[PDB]
Design a protein around this nucleic acid. Structure first.
Ligand SMILES: [Mg+2]
Ligand SMILES: [Mg+2]
Ligand SMILES: [Mg+2]
Ligand SMILES: [Mg+2]
Ligand SMILES: [Mg+2]
Ligand SMILES: [Mg+2]
Ligand SMILES: [Mg+2]
Ligand SMILES: [Mg+2]
Ligand SMILES: [Mg+2]
Ligand SMILES: [Mg+2]
Ligand SMILES: [Mg+2]
Ligand SMILES: [Mg+2]
Ligand SMILES: [Mg+2]
Ligand SMILES: [Zn+2]
Lengths: 122, 97, 96, 107, 116, 45, 23, 86, 136
RNA sequence: AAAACUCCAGUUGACACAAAAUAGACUACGAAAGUGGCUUUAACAUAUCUGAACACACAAUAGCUAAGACCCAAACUGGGAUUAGAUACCCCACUAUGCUUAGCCCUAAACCUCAACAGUUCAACAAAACUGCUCGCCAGAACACUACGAGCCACAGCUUAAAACUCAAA
């Protein structure tokens, strides 16, 4: 199926960042993925202090790897991302552009519930 | 002779369509303090506050213009089997003539 | 007989009301919109009575917010101060 | 076990297959797919193997075949996840349903 | 917008667990509950504190801090007058909304109809 | 149509030969997912 | 309903368990 | 603890009016329901009692807003008596 | 013109308090328990400057959990902040005790100027399980 | 209030095998028990219906056996209060236990005390009154969630389940 890899990486320079993306994509292709796109959401401050691999990170570079992987490669891939020390946080999800949007007619109104109680005098 | 259905289709109240946002003319017929009781046709009367601007030409028999938000003003509540009727319509007075 | 009423589906039927995001694609990476639907002070996800969304859209906002907060896209305890400037869409009133 | 290079059921009738490149062939193969599509391929393979018309899907034989591939799936899930009581129940109930349909088809 | 009551009660024909288990039947009564009373206030604390910090600082001399002794005294006087004013105010009219008795008159005029 | 749409979409897939150039293209590019909604159903980018 | 039957069975059960503990 | 320290649940005084600054802050906590969360988590509420309490609160909410809707619906017929002498 | 929201640390901010920005104003932490109220004044770089509590001020057992006790403790902590040379204060409260406002007003009358109120009350997202319910 | 702690408390920084604020004014999934932090994999029986208390598979919590984890809570126990006494309510401390793994135990006010399928519009309280068909159950109270027998990884157990005396009611 098609997967999307959200990748928060350590705040680096251009050659180290390029080498880290190279290693991640090469690991994907070795585990058996055909990689579709790479996107750069860019370097920004983290929402909170993510502590990973005995370092406390305050800023990070957000990258996206859109790819297709077989159903038995995701666990190996998350193991490799767990062992990589240049990655603050790597996560694989199913693709929101592979889930399809349904047409919605609108909000159907709801009336008040009726005949909940008997019409005795009480 | 003409039928009741003929009266219905060639009646203006059926030619109205939905009651909301329709401008109507009407007569003042009852006044207490500053609560003006206006008829607009239809089953019930509306009650409007006296507009403080031009506030003395709102008298018994005066023609006024109304926005007519509602025709009946009922609603059902938590345990009721029927609606609670106000016996009164809803309208916003715009002015004279 | 030409004047008796005839059966048809309701004319003057207003089209059904649509929620604000109805037809739009929500993502866990859309932390400007998810920040719109998060509370500015406490980070609380607003309810249906505040957001005014349909059931499906409110569910997707909740799931996307929880996802983004656990993946590291959103703060949990507050709204982004960079995003306390965007068009407010929630029916809440804090100040007075 | 169909090989991982087998094509999807929805995609095995389009004319352009042998000329597309190997990455597209892999991408729409069953290696780039899941166990539901593998079960669909296995079920239609059995349908071609056994029944007269494989385009009915409303007969006792077709329902027995669908129950059999679902029973195989429930089994394989159980020997991975041994402690799955809901799926153990589903497997036993599906076995009993297949036995009922077998008795009806025999009679 | 009121929360719906579609399948929230244990009823015949309901295929769900009961969401709500109301101890009283959910029918609007013809009454409004009475207005609750305010609770204990414990006024004058800060002025008492500053007067009496004087007292421990200057060996309990009224001639030493007359000024915020008078502060404590007029705090007591304003608190009593505030008591009188708020009692007359709540007897006169509720803030914004109305008195429970007059609302009970309106609801007696427009009763609920749980029966036929 | 899906086969033909997928066929033209593979020509810009990342391979071993496109890896370095595509990583540098990703590094000097930037995509933004953030967009806001108004009270009316309209997008402010 | 009230709980008098439940109370009678409760005391029967309690005395039974005390008897089993004693003997 | 791992977030930025001085943004969440933070309000500012105007002209030195710490009273309305706190009253705003307590209003923030009340409208977000944090105050009742602390008051309920002082002691452990067992899940049966939790479910009973939330069902009760939901039923009370239903009843209260239906009555409020009726009161707002009849406040217009709380005008002066139109026909005094019957 | 006014914002009740705080100034973000890393941008321009025209707001000043005796030359200092928002980020270097000293912080007074008030832990308001149901039995005690503790006020500690620290700098922006976490240098302790003042510490006072109800038990320090002399209330012994149950009179500690009152308004007047926290008011006295805030006055004493404010006096120690003044002799350490502190004028502007950012207040952070933790707890729900009786003497929360009372500790703040003790600081105010001691002579500190509050510029911002923060509520760091610990609210678990269902973490540790609290004590059993009392059968009073 | 005492007891307790002062190897204590406040700010900050590191830091989980425990538990999953807000959303939740939503009414979903599952046969029932049950299920509300995130991701992924597998996956939610039956193209009539009812039907096993001679079967099979599950079944909250508590509990048992073996090996681990330990923040917090906590039967038992200890100390302090209270009391005529206080083996309780209140405060403090700590253990079994709650957690994981593997195997048992098979019970709940397991109740929405309202059987499955198909269909329609009055005893009293409660959640209006019914029709067709099938299964299960019941037949005065108490003895009795008991005795005996039988089965069971249960051995202070569970399931099934009486009678003799007693009453003119329950
Ligand atoms: Mg009841
Ligand atoms: Mg002592
Ligand atoms: Mg856990
Ligand atoms: Mg059956
Ligand atoms: Mg059975
Ligand atoms: Mg069990
Ligand atoms: Mg403990
Ligand atoms: Mg232990
Ligand atoms: Mg239950
Ligand atoms: Mg039963
Ligand atoms: Mg049955
Ligand atoms: Mg028993
Ligand atoms: Mg027995
Ligand atoms: Zn919608």
């Amino acid at each position: 199926p098609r997967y999307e890899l959200a990748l928060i990486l350590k705040a680096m320079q251009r050659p180290e960042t390029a080498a880290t993306l190279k290693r991640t994509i090469e690991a994907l292709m070795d585990r058996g993925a055909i990689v579709r796109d790479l996107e750069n959401l860019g370097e920004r401050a983290l929402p909170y202090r993510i502590s990973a691999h005995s370092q406390q990170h305050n800023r990070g570079g957000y990258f996206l790897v859109d790819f297709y992987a077989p159903t038995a490669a995701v666990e190996s891939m998350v193991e490799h991302l767990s062992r990589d020390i240049d990655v603050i946080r790597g996560n694989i999800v199913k693709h929101p552009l592979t889930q399809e949007l349904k047409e919605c007619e609108g909000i159907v109104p709801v009336p008040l519930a009726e005949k909940l109680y008997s019409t005795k005098k009480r | 002779v003409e039928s009741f259905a003929s009266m219905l289709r060639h009646s203006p109240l059926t030619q109205m369509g939905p009651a909301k946002d329709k401008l109507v003319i009407g007569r003042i017929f009852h006044i207490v303090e500053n609560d003006l009781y206006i008829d607009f046709g239809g089953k019930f009367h509306c009650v409007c506050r006296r507009p403080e601007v031009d506030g003395e030409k709102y008298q018994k028999g005066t023609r006024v213009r109304l926005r007519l938000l509602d025709l009946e003003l009922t609603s059902r509540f938590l345990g009721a089997t029927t609606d609670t009727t106000v016996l009164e319509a809803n309208a916003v007075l715009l002015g004279i003539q | 007989n030409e004047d008796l009423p005839i059966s048809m589906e309701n004319p003057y039927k207003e089209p059904l009301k649509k929620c604000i995001l109805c037809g739009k694609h929500v993502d866990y990476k859309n932390v400007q919109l998810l920040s719109q639907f998060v509370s500015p002070f406490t980070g609380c996800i607003y309810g249906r009575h505040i957001t005014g969304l349909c059931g499906k859209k409110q569910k997707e906002i909740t799931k996307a917010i929880k996802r983004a907060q656990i993946m590291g896209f959103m703060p949990v305890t507050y709204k982004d101060p960079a995003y306390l400037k965007d068009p407010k869409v929630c029916n809440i009133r804090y100040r007075e | 076990d169909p090989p991982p290079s087998t094509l999807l059921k929805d995609y095995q009738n389009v004319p352009g297959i042998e000329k597309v490149d190997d990455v597209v062939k892999r991408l729409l193969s069953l290696e780039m797919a899941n166990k539901k599509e593998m079960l669909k391929i296995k079920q239609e393979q059995f349908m071609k193997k056994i029944v007269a018309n494989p385009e009915d899907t409303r007969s006792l034989e077709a329902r027995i075949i669908a129950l059999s591939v679902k029973i195989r799936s429930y089994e394989e899930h159980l020997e991975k996840h041994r402690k799955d009581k809901a799926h153990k129940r589903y497997l036993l109930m599906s076995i009993d349903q297949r036995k009922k349909m077998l008795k009806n088809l025999r009679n | 917008a009121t929360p719906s009551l579609r399948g929230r009660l244990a009823r015949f024909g309901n295929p769900r667990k009961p969401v709500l288990k109301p101890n009283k039947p959910l029918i609007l009564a013809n009454r409004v509950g009475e207005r609750r009373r305010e609770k204990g206030e414990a006024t004058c604390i800060t002025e008492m504190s500053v007067m009496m910090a004087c007292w421990k600082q200057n060996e309990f001399r009224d001639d030493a801090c007359r000024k915020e002794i008078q502060g404590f005294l007029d705090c007591a006087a304003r608190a009593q007058e505030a008591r009188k004013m708020r009692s007359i105010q709540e007897t006169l009219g509720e803030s914004g909304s109305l008195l429970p008795n007059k609302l009970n008159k309106l609801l007696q005029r427009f009763p609920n109809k749980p029966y036929l | 149509r899906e086969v033909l749409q997928l066929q033209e979409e593979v020509k810009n897939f990342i391979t071993r030969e496109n890896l370095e150039a595509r990583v540098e293209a990703a590094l000097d590019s930037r995509k933004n997912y953030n967009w806001a909604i108004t009270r009316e159903g309209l997008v402010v980018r | 309903k009230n709980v008098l039957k439940i109370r009678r069975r409760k005391m029967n059960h309690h005395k039974y368990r005390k008897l089993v503990k004693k003997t | 603890a791992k977030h930025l320290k001085f943004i969440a649940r933070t309000v500012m005084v105007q002209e030195g009016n710490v009273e309305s600054a706190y009253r705003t802050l307590n209003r923030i906590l009340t409208m977000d329901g944090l105050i009742e969360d602390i008051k309920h988590r002082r002691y452990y509420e067992k899940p049966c009692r939790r479910r009973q309490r939330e069902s009760y609160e939901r039923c009370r909410r239903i009843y209260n807003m239906e009555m409020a809707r009726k009161i707002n619906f009849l406040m217009r017929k709380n005008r002066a008596d139109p026909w005094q002498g019957c | 013109k006014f914002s009740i929201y705080p100034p973000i640390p890393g941008e321009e901010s025209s707001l000043r308090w005796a030359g200092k920005k928002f980020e270097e104003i000293p912080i007074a932490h008030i832990k308001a328990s149901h039995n005690n109220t503790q006020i500690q004044v620290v700098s922006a770089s976490n240098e302790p400057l003042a510490f006072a509590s109800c038990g320090t001020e002399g209330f012994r057992n149950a009179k500690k959990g009152t308004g007047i006790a926290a008011q006295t403790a805030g006055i004493a902590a404010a006096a120690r902040a003044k002799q350490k040379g502190v004028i502007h204060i950012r207040v952070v409260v933790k707890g729900l005790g009786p003497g929360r406002l009372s500790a703040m007003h003790g600081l105010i009358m001691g002579g500190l100027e509050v510029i911002s109120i923060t509520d760091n009350t610990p609210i678990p997202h269902n973490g540790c399980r609290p004590r059993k319910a009392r059968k009073l």
